[PDB]
Amino acid sequence: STECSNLLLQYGSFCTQLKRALTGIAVEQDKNTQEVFAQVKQIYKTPPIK
Amino acid sequence: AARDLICAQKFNGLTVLPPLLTDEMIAQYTSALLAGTITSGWTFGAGAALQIPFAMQMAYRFNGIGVTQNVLYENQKLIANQFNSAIGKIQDSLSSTASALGKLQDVVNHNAQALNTLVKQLSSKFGAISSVLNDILSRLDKVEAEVQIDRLITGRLQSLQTYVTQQLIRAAEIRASANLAATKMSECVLGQSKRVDF
Amino acid sequence: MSLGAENSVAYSNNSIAIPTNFTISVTTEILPVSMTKTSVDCTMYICGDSTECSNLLLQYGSFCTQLKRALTGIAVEQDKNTQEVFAQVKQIYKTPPIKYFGGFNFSQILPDPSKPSKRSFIEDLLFNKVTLADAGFIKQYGDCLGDIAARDLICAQKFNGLTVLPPLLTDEMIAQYTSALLAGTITSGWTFGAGAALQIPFAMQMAYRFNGIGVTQNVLYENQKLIANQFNSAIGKIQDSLSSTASALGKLQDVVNHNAQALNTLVKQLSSKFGAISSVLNDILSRLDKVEAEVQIDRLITGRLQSLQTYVTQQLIRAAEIRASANLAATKMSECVLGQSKRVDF
Amino acid sequence: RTQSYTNSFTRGVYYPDKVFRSSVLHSTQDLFLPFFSNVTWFHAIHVDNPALPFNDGVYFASTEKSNIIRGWIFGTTLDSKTQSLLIVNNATNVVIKVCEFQFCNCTFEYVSQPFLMDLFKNLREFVFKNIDGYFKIYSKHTPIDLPQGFSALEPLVDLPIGINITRFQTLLAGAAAYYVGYLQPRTFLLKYNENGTITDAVDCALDPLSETKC
Amino acid sequence: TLKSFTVEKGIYQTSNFRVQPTESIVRFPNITNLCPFHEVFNATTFASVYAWNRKRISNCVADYSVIYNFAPFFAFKCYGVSPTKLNDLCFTNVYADSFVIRGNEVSQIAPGQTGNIADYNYKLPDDFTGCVIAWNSNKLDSKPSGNYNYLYRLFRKSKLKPFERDISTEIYQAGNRPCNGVAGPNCYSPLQSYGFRPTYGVGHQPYRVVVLSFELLHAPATVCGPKKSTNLVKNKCVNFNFNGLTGTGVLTESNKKFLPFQQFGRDIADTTDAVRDPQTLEILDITPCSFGGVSVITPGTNTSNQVAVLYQGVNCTEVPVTGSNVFQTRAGCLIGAEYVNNSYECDIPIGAGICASYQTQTSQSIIAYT
Numbered sequence A: 001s002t003e004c005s006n007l008l009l010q011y012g013s014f015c016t017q018l019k020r021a022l023t024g025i026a027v028e029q030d031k032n033t034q035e036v037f038a039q040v041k042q043i044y045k046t047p048p049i050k
Numbered sequence B: 001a002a003r004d005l006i007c008a009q010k011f012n013g014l015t016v017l018p019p020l021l022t023d024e025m026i027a028q029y030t031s032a033l034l035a036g037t038i039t040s041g042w043t044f045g046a047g048a049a050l051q052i053p054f055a056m057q058m059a060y061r062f063n064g065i066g067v068t069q070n071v072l073y074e075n076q077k078l079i080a081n082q083f084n085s086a087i088g089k090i091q092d093s094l095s096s097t098a099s100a101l102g103k104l105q106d107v108v109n110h111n112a113q114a115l116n117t118l119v120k121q122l123s124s125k126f127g128a129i130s131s132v133l134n135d136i137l138s139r140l141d142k143v144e145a146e147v148q149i150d151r152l153i154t155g156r157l158q159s160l161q162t163y164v165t166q167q168l169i170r171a172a173e174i175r176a177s178a179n180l181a182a183t184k185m186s187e188c189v190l191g192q193s194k195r196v197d198f
Numbered sequence C: 001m002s003l004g005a006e007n008s009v010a011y012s013n014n015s016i017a018i019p020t021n022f023t024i025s026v027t028t029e030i031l032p033v034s035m036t037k038t039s040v041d042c043t044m045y046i047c048g049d050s051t052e053c054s055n056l057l058l059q060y061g062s063f064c065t066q067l068k069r070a071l072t073g074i075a076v077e078q079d080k081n082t083q084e085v086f087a088q089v090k091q092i093y094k095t096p097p098i099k100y101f102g103g104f105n106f107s108q109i110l111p112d113p114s115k116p117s118k119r120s121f122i123e124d125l126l127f128n129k130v131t132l133a134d135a136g137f138i139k140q141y142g143d144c145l146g147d148i149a150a151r152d153l154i155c156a157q158k159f160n161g162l163t164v165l166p167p168l169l170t171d172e173m174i175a176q177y178t179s180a181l182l183a184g185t186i187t188s189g190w191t192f193g194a195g196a197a198l199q200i201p202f203a204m205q206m207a208y209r210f211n212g213i214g215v216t217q218n219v220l221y222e223n224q225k226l227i228a229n230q231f232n233s234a235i236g237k238i239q240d241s242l243s244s245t246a247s248a249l250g251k252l253q254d255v256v257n258h259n260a261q262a263l264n265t266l267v268k269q270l271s272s273k274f275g276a277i278s279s280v281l282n283d284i285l286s287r288l289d290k291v292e293a294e295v296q297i298d299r300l301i302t303g304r305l306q307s308l309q310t311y312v313t314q315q316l317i318r319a320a321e322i323r324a325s326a327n328l329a330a331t332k333m334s335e336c337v338l339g340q341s342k343r344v345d346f
Numbered sequence D: 001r002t003q004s005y006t007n008s009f010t011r012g013v014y015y016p017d018k019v020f021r022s023s024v025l026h027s028t029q030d031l032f033l034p035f036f037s038n039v040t041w042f043h044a045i046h047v048d049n050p051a052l053p054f055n056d057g058v059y060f061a062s063t064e065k066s067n068i069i070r071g072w073i074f075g076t077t078l079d080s081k082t083q084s085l086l087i088v089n090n091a092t093n094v095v096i097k098v099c100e101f102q103f104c105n106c107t108f109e110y111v112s113q114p115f116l117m118d119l120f121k122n123l124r125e126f127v128f129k130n131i132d133g134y135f136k137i138y139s140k141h142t143p144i145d146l147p148q149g150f151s152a153l154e155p156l157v158d159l160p161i162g163i164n165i166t167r168f169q170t171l172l173a174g175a176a177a178y179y180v181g182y183l184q185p186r187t188f189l190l191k192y193n194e195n196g197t198i199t200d201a202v203d204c205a206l207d208p209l210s211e212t213k214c
Numbered sequence E: 001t002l003k004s005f006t007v008e009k010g011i012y013q014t015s016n017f018r019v020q021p022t023e024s025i026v027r028f029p030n031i032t033n034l035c036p037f038h039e040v041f042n043a044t045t046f047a048s049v050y051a052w053n054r055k056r057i058s059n060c061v062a063d064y065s066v067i068y069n070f071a072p073f074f075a076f077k078c079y080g081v082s083p084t085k086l087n088d089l090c091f092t093n094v095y096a097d098s099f100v101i102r103g104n105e106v107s108q109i110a111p112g113q114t115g116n117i118a119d120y121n122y123k124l125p126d127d128f129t130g131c132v133i134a135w136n137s138n139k140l141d142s143k144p145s146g147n148y149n150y151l152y153r154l155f156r157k158s159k160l161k162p163f164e165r166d167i168s169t170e171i172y173q174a175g176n177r178p179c180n181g182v183a184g185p186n187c188y189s190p191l192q193s194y195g196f197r198p199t200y201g202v203g204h205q206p207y208r209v210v211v212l213s214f215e216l217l218h219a220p221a222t223v224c225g226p227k228k229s230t231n232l233v234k235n236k237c238v239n240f241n242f243n244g245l246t247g248t249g250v251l252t253e254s255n256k257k258f259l260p261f262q263q264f265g266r267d268i269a270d271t272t273d274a275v276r277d278p279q280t281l282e283i284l285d286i287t288p289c290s291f292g293g294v295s296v297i298t299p300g301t302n303t304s305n306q307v308a309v310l311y312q313g314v315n316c317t318e319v320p321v322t323g324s325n326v327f328q329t330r331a332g333c334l335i336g337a338e339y340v341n342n343s344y345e346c347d348i349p350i351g352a353g354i355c356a357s358y359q360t361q362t363s364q365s366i367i368a369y370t
């Protein structure tokens, strides 16, 4: 809708704040997965005998 | 004919982004960290990996708990059989009871029910006469349709701000638990622990 | 994306591998402690010297007492964070004039009296790298009362009741705390963390640390010069890495940028209408009679209260996150500066 | 006629309001010339059809150094039947007329200083639009084809006429050359300097880089 | 502030000081003529709704209290502006249009209202900051045989878009058959007359309506109300009423380079900062006069009652003025406590390495120290 978007534009940067916060949440999960698991520099390989 | 809620969350502007690391890449990291503990001990967490057999690798770790290394070399087969029996028992314990994974289920269920209660609140009226925009702009002219749209926008913005606040608090809790998991991974897999009941 | 370089350990049940040489390395790590303390005046922000808006706000409710209490608690919490992470020593030590610590350099870290602030080289590089903004009450309503062709945001945020409190502990006492901790670590070892400071030369302290990590102390006294040269080269490499790349203090720059962006959004929120006919209180009270102006002022006050609640809630979440990071920094200072920690990769 | 197409580049930016702003970035939605558009080049040679539609905003340009272009006639039709707008400038004092004399109701005679202060290349630039009964005039003189630079046009003269305009033409005293650009509603971001003059701008609906900048 | 009869030891924030304004300054443009509202309202005849007459009012002084005398209308109901606040603030241009309509069509001359007259005769904008005056004229614009002087348009190929007037009349083509000036079966005359009789009902009586369209902002003001002007003053926190834009602040000389079409200077937060004087062409910076926070430093009520005041973030070489001891800090300055060269532990904090205490002196007072 166009006129509803026009009436939403009369409000301030509320949706600029909310879209920025969820992006900041969405970047944080990648940091958590990289910090927890990627603690080894080189990918090791087991010997074929067990 | 039986439509799922995933399509409703899809068309109502609530996308879900994929993670950067896929399921296979985490498995390669976990396989590498298993290959470091078996074939190198705790030496690969400090510098470079050093080749060492598992006999003196197990004999090193009894010296950390106050037992001399003759105990392992006089009781190797019993320890191996007990380790194999424990591995089989924990395999049967995970294979039998499905209620052990309660922590990882709630992470899915909280987000699913939060999106479900966000999508469901569009059927509310928020002090207006109808829950559909197109009805009140087909029926009412703009002078009071502006007021009705303002009431609906106020209600929807309040609900969206409540959802964003709940997501922020849940992400902070998950970040704290992830840092606890990170220090547990860095301390207990890559090395030995003198902290009791850690 | 590549997960990393491939490696394969040639493992056999008769093969052991032990090192024949060592290498001393120096690694930095950056943690935030505190943020910019703020305080919000309701009547100067929402109304801006309008009596009708003040009457409607006192008729509205008691949210501002809650907001002022929350911001005061955040400010006291920030001062508690800095106090807890830094002031852990009981007596302020000073360094001896003789600077021969067994061949180790120890010159980029100890302060020098040539600067007016007793700050060393690396602290000076760290303070020069961060583009600091809104230090505190460095203005004192003097420049903003004057005339500037290009008005900055800081005068606008000061004129609308959004002040920045100065911190309780300024830079000089922080430098004195760090100098005292360096003097204790260099001279006494870890004994100043338990009781009084017990003097010991640096060679026996390094022998103590090598006996802690699991290497016989005869290795140190046969390899003192190589360890000293490797330590000096590592300090030089760290100094060159800070002097070359300016992208290493991203967390602190993120903290300052977050606070500046939040205050900018709070200032720029008043430019909107919130469904009212004008964004100026004076135009509403001058153009209209009483009842419709009360309606428009009611809408504007509801919108400004919603914006201030959003800002205060975001500030509280940020305060909790920075408190958790400051507690981790404090326990790292307690367990690694004041002693030897056996936890792997702590 | 010699109808030719040239790149408009970035030569269609003006002050959208009469408010001084210094060192601030303000985003406005107004009728504007899109960046890197095409304008129509005409070589009007008389010993040709000057019929040009309005299409909601006219951007006028002239690179002629001499004062050979005289005025502009506006309106819907020019047949002494309906109202038509008749700016005539005899290079001494400009005269605005609402009457519809064939090749000479407000009747607004604005007799003052002309719109053509010019005596290097000395390019001239005009922007005409009509929103809520108001024919605006923006004009600047740039001593430099279209150059690679910015020039903010100022609302120097306003007209409260309130008529309807569809067809417009030019007036001469045959080496006439002028550029016609069209206006569409768009979103811009305008950079004010410390002196209050527009020096930089960006279109919000041209490129994904420009949309990211907006 | 704390809603308690006893307070504990510590620093407390209570209120804020503000320099009160002194006098009132009103600056209006130098216009002396009187606006001819009597010529608009006291006219013998009015034009039709499809050919409404537009009158431009500028360069005079408007009295809006005399409108009630000229016409016996119901009420003066308006959008965006009030009847009672017209004489205080003032405008740029005044547009007056007058025409005659029926009683049924009074409700559709409004912003956002559409219908027959609003689609074919006279359309208002949505942001229309003006209003109408309507009154019955059944004793003047009605005849026993019928007043056929007024016409209206029924058919048009499009809707009306605002502040436009149609003059030319063409026979409408309601079908595929062309008309070419002949009123056939699918061709109709575009104009129909009003049937005005005194025996009709109140819903179909003639009504004389006058709309006053007013323009806000820009275009340095030509019409303003009857309020007199006041001499200009500088470097004092006084009230100002500049062209109806009220406020409170310090008027001072400015060095800004306004363009000649520009009159207002806006801050970042959408607030007027630089203003143009309507009498003489000079540019004045508007800054609000001094204010700031006030902190109360005290020990407990069980101990003492002596109180030191901290003025937060302001220089007290210009303090609006409480003891006799003044010490300057980075956070502000302290009144009611002296300064000592001793160094003690921090009893109560202030900031930037300043701490206060209640200590002996001979003999009990409040001292400040590093």
Ligand SMILES: *[C@@H]1O[C@H](CO)[C@@H](O[C@@H]2O[C@H](CO)[C@@H](O)[C@H](O)[C@H]2NC(C)=O)[C@H](O)[C@H]1NC(C)=O
Residues within 6 Å of the ligand: C020, C021, C022, C226, C229, C230
């Ligand atoms: C252990 O490593 C150090 C490097 O720090 C070796 O010292 C180097 O020895 C070579 C001998 O040819 C010299 O050329 C280098 O200049 C030395 N480097 C430094 C920094 O002093 C040391 O020799 C190694 N130990 C053994 C037993 O080889």
Ligand SMILES: *[C@@H]1O[C@H](CO)[C@@H](O[C@@H]2O[C@H](CO)[C@@H](O)[C@H](O)[C@H]2NC(C)=O)[C@H](O)[C@H]1NC(C)=O
Residues within 6 Å of the ligand: C105, C106, C107, C108
């Ligand atoms: C300790 O490190 C400092 C820092 O590099 C050394 O001081 C520099 O020494 C070089 C060698 O001639 C001079 O060119 C520089 O001008 C010195 N810098 C300063 C700031 O004095 C110092 O020599 C090292 N050794 C000792 C014992 O202090």
Ligand SMILES: *[C@@H]1O[C@H](CO)[C@@H](O)[C@H](O)[C@H]1NC(C)=O
Residues within 6 Å of the ligand: A049, C013
């Ligand atoms: C060592 O590994 C080889 C290879 O599998 C195996 O045959 C042997 O039994 C192992 N043990 C000893 C003591 O050699």
Ligand SMILES: *[C@@H]1O[C@H](CO)[C@@H](O)[C@H](O)[C@H]1NC(C)=O
Residues within 6 Å of the ligand: D005, D036, D037, D038, D039
């Ligand atoms: C302008 O129009 C001409 C002719 O239609 C065309 O050749 C030219 O590419 C256009 N300019 C653009 C698309 O930028």
Ligand SMILES: *[C@@H]1O[C@H](CO)[C@@H](O)[C@H](O)[C@H]1NC(C)=O
Residues within 6 Å of the ligand: D099, D100, D105, D107
């Ligand atoms: C408008 O007024 C002028 C003044 O002479 C006149 O020539 C012209 O015919 C008028 N146009 C109309 C009445 O449409």
Ligand SMILES: *[C@@H]1O[C@H](CO)[C@@H](O)[C@H](O)[C@H]1NC(C)=O
Residues within 6 Å of the ligand: D164, D165, D166, E158, E161, E162, E164
């Ligand atoms: C002007 O006339 C055209 C028909 O040529 C019409 O479509 C338009 O609505 C009119 N009004 C304007 C541009 O306000």
Ligand SMILES: *[C@@H]1O[C@H](CO)[C@@H](O)[C@H](O)[C@H]1NC(C)=O
Residues within 6 Å of the ligand: D193, D194, D195
């Ligand atoms: C602003 O005006 C001054 C006055 O001459 C001039 O020196 C300065 O260069 C101007 N600023 C810019 C960005 O051109």
Ligand SMILES: *[C@@H]1O[C@H](CO)[C@@H](O)[C@H](O)[C@H]1NC(C)=O
Residues within 6 Å of the ligand: E030, E279
């Ligand atoms: C009106 O403005 C000021 C008022 O004192 C005066 O100096 C000026 O000469 C006056 N002008 C006219 C035309 O009355």
Ligand SMILES: *[C@@H]1O[C@H](CO)[C@@H](O)[C@H](O)[C@H]1NC(C)=O
Residues within 6 Å of the ligand: E042, E043
């Ligand atoms: C209006 O004013 C005129 C004076 O110009 C007067 O003759 C007339 O009676 C008044 N009233 C009406 C209803 O015209």
Ligand SMILES: *[C@@H]1O[C@H](CO)[C@@H](O)[C@H](O)[C@H]1NC(C)=O
Residues within 6 Å of the ligand: C140, C142, E315, E316, E317, E328
């Ligand atoms: C306060 O005022 C004095 C004199 O008016 C001035 O020298 C000083 O710089 C000002 N600021 C502070 C922080 O003392």
